Amino acid sequence: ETIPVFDGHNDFLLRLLRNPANRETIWLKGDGTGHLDLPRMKEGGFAGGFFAIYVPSPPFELPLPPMIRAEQAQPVALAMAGHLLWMERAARGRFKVCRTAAEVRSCHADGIVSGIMHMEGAEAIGADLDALHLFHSLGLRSLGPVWSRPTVFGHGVPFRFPGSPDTGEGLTEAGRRLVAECNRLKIMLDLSHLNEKGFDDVARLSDAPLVATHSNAHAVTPSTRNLTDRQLAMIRESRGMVGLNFATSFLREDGRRSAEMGWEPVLRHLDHLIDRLGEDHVGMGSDFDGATIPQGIADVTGLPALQAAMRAHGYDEPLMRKLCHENWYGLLERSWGA
Amino acid sequence: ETIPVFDGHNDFLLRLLRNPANRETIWLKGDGTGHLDLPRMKEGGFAGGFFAIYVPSPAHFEAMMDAPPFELPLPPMIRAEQAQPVALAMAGHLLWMERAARGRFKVCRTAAEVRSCHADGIVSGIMHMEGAEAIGADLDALHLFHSLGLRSLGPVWSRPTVFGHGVPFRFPGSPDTGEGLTEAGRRLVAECNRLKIMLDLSHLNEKGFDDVARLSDAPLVATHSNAHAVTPSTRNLTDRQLAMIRESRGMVGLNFATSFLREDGRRSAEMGWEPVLRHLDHLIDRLGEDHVGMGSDFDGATIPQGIADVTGLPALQAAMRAHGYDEPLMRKLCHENWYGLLERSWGA
Numbered sequence: 001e002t003i004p005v006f007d008g009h010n011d012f013l014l015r016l017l018r019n020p021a022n023r024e025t026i027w028l029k030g031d032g033t034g035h036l037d038l039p040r041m042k043e044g045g046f047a048g049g050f051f052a053i054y055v056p057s058p059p060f061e062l063p064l065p066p067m068i069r070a071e072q073a074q075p076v077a078l079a080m081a082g083h084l085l086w087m088e089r090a091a092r093g094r095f096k097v098c099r100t101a102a103e104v105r106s107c108h109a110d111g112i113v114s115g116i117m118h119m120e121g122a123e124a125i126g127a128d129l130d131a132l133h134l135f136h137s138l139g140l141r142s143l144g145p146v147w148s149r150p151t152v153f154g155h156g157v158p159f160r161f162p163g164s165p166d167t168g169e170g171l172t173e174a175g176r177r178l179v180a181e182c183n184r185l186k187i188m189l190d191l192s193h194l195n196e197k198g199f200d201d202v203a204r205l206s207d208a209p210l211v212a213t214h215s216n217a218h219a220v221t222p223s224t225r226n227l228t229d230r231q232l233a234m235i236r237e238s239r240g241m242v243g244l245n246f247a248t249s250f251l252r253e254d255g256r257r258s259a260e261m262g263w264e265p266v267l268r269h270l271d272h273l274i275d276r277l278g279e280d281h282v283g284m285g286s287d288f289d290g291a292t293i294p295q296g297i298a299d300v301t302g303l304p305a306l307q308a309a310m311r312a313h314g315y316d317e318p319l320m321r322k323l324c325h326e327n328w329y330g331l332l333e334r335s336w337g338a
Numbered sequence: 339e340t341i342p343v344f345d346g347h348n349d350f351l352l353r354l355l356r357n358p359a360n361r362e363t364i365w366l367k368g369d370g371t372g373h374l375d376l377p378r379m380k381e382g383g384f385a386g387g388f389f390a391i392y393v394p395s396p397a398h399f400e401a402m403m404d405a406p407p408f409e410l411p412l413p414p415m416i417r418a419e420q421a422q423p424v425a426l427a428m429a430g431h432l433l434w435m436e437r438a439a440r441g442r443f444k445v446c447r448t449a450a451e452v453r454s455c456h457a458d459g460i461v462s463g464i465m466h467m468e469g470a471e472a473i474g475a476d477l478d479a480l481h482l483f484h485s486l487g488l489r490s491l492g493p494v495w496s497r498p499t500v501f502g503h504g505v506p507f508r509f510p511g512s513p514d515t516g517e518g519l520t521e522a523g524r525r526l527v528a529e530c531n532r533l534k535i536m537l538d539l540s541h542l543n544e545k546g547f548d549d550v551a552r553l554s555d556a557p558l559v560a561t562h563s564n565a566h567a568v569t570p571s572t573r574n575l576t577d578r579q580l581a582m583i584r585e586s587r588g589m590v591g592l593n594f595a596t597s598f599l600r601e602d603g604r605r606s607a608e609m610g611w612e613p614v615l616r617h618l619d620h621l622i623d624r625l626g627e628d629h630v631g632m633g634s635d636f637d638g639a640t641i642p643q644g645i646a647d648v649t650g651l652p653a654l655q656a657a658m659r660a661h662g663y664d665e666p667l668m669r670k671l672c673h674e675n676w677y678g679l680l681e682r683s684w685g686a
C-alpha cells in the first residue's frame with residue numbers, strides 16, 4: 001500500500017551527462033550511487049516525474065555564477081534531452097516521455113514510469129525565443145526561466161540563509177516575452193529559483209496556474225529558495241501547485257545541509273503548505289539527485305518510509321493520494337488542458 | 339501552363355542565418371537578392387521543397403571555379419559542439435517561416451502532408467540536414483532532430499565528418515575521392531533506415547555511396563546531383579551510380595549549378611538550355627521517367643541566366659516542353675516523382 005508518487009523535479013539527467021559511457025548501467029541497473037535509477041524507482045513506488053534539463057556551471061551565501069549564453073548552453077541541453085529520449089528507447093516500454101496530461105494518467109494506470117521533459121534555467125533559449133519552439137517540438141512541457149544564476153530573461157536567487165527571496169531585479173523584456181510565449185504554447189512555467197521580483201512579474205503576466213516545482217515554506221525555513229506566505233497566497237489564487245523539496249537545507253529550521261534529521265521538519269513544511277495553499281495545491285518536488293536529502297528518505301526507495309511518516313502524522317488516505325500524485329495530475333490538466 | 343514544382347534542395351535558410359534581423363522582410367517580402375522568398379515562390383510556381391540545414395565552413399573559391407581544371411581543398415571537420423548551435427539556429431528559422439507565413443507555408447513530416455499542401459496550394463517544406471556535423475557519433479541527436487521534424491539527411495557535405503567523407507569540388511575528376519563510411523557512418527545509415535529518415539547521397543564520395551548502396555534498405559537518393567557522363571564534376575553521378583539508384587527505385591534531383599551542368603564545368607551563368615536538357619535526357623534515359631526531378635540548389639549555387647531565380651521555373655518548363663517532354667512526363671519531373679519517392683522512403 002505504497003501509493004505511487006509523481007514527483008515535481010529530479011536531476012537524474014545530470015548523472016548521465018557526467019558519465020555517458022556508463023548510461024546503460026546507471027539507468028537500467030543502478031551504479032549503487034545517487035538517488036535514482038529504473039529498478040529503484042520501481043522498488044520505491046516512483047510513478048514518474050519531471051526530469052530536468054539543467055546546464056551546470058563550472059549563516060551563509062554562495063555567490064551567483066556567471067551567465068551562460070545560448071551558444072554554450074545549447075549543446076549541453078541537447079546532450080541531456082538526448083539522454084532522456086535514450087532512457088525511453090532503452091527501457092523498452094517501461095518508461096515513457098509524456099507530452100500530455102492524458103499520457104501521464106495512462107502511464108499511471110498502466111504502471112509505466114512517466115517522465116516530463118523540463119528545463120531548469122532557460123539558457124539554451126535565445127532572447128529571440130526561436131529555440132523555445134524547437135524544444136517544444138522535442139517534447140519540452142515545463143520551463144523554469146532561471147536557475148540560481150542570471151539569464152537574458154531575469155534573475156534567480158543566490159543560495160543564502162537566512163534571507164528574503166527579494167534578492168535582485170525582475171524579468172527583462174525578453175523574460176516577459178518568454179512568459180507570453182510559454183502561455184501560448186502551454187508550456188508550464190516553473191518559479192523555483194526565480195527571485196521575488198521575477199515571481200511578481202510572472203504572477204502579473206501569466207494566464208496559467210503559478211507553479212514552483214521544488215520549493216518549501218519560507219515561514220518555516222527562511223532560505224532565499226523558499227516561498228513567503230504572500231507568494232503562497234498568489235499561488236493559491238492562481239490554482240497553482242508547490243512541490244516539496246527534500247533538500248535538508250530547505251527543510252531544517254536551521255537551514256543546515258546535514259542529513260541527520262527526523263521527519264518533523266518535512267511534516268512542518270507539509271503542514272504549512274497544506275494550511276496555506278489548500279489540500280489540492282501541494283505535492284512532492286524531491287530534487288532527487290540534485291540535493292542532500294534526509295537520512296530517513298536517503299534515495300527514491302525511501303518514499304514508502306516518507307509515506308508512513310505522513311500517515312502517522314494523521315494525513316487521511318484521500319489527502320495521501322492527492323499529495324503523492326493526484327495534485328500534480330490535476331495541475332497538469334489546468335496548465336496544458338485535459 | 340506552369341506545373342507546380344517540388345524541389346530537391348535549397349539553401350534559403352542560410353540567408354536567414356546570415357541576416358536574422360531582417361528575416362521578416364527576407365522571407366515575407368523578399369529583399370531583392372538571392373533566388374527564393376515567399377512572393378517569388380508563388381510567382382514561379384514553387385510548390386515546396388527540401389530546406390537544407392547546412393553548417394557553413396569559414397571570393398577565393400568562386401574564383402577557382404571560374405577557370406577549370408580546378409580543385410578546392412577540403413575544409414576542416416566541424417564537431418557537434420560547434421555545429422549544434424548553428425543547426426539549431428537554422429532549424430529555428432525554418433519553424434519561424436511557418437509561424438510567420440500564417441498558413442501559406444507548412445513544414446511537412448509525412449508524404450500525405452506534402453500531398454495535402456500540393457492540393458491546397460500551400461508551400462511545403464521538408465526539414466533537411468546537409469552534412470551531419472550536428473549529430474554526434476553516438477546518434478543521440480539524430481533522434482532529437484527527428485522529433486522536431488528532420489526527415490532527410492546527407493551524412494556529409496564536401497568536408498570530412500565522423501561518419502565519412504565528402505567529395506572535394508573538382509573538375510574534371512572521379513567521385514572516387516576518398517575513404518568510405520566510418521563505423522559511425524554505418525550505424526547512421528542503419529538508424530536513418532529505422533527512423534525512416536531519407537538518406538541524401540549528394541556530396542558523398544564514391545566509396546561512401548557504395549557503402550550506403552550495400553547497407554541501406556531504402557531507395558537511394560541524391561537530391562542535387564547531375565550526370566558525370568555529361569559533366570565530369572566530382573559532384574556528379576557515374577552511370578554505375580545511376581544503375582544502383584535505378585535498381586533501388588530511388589531518385590535524382592537535377593542541380594541548377596552551372597558548374598555541374600556545363601560540359602566545360604565552368605561557373606559562368608552565361609549559358610543556354612542545351613546542357614540542362616542534355617543532363618535531363620541522360621538521367622531520364624538511364625534512371626527511368628519515374629526517378630528524376632529537380633534539385634535546384636537555389637540560394638546555394640550560381641545558376642543559368644535563363645533561370646536566374648525561382649521566378650525562372652516557368653522558363654525552364656517551356657524549354658523542357660519545347661524539347662518535346664510530354665505533359666505526363668512534365669508532371670513527373672516537376673513534382674510527382676518526388677512525392678512518389680517520399681512514399682517509398684517514409685511510407686504512404
Ligand SMILES: [Mg+2]
Pocket residue numbers: 009010011052054120290
Ligand atoms: Mg535540478
Ligand SMILES: [Mg+2]
Pocket residue numbers: 120192193214287290
Ligand atoms: Mg533546482
Ligand SMILES: [Mg+2]
Pocket residue numbers: 347348349390392468638
Ligand atoms: Mg545546400
Ligand SMILES: [Mg+2]
Pocket residue numbers: 468540541562635638
Ligand atoms: Mg549542396
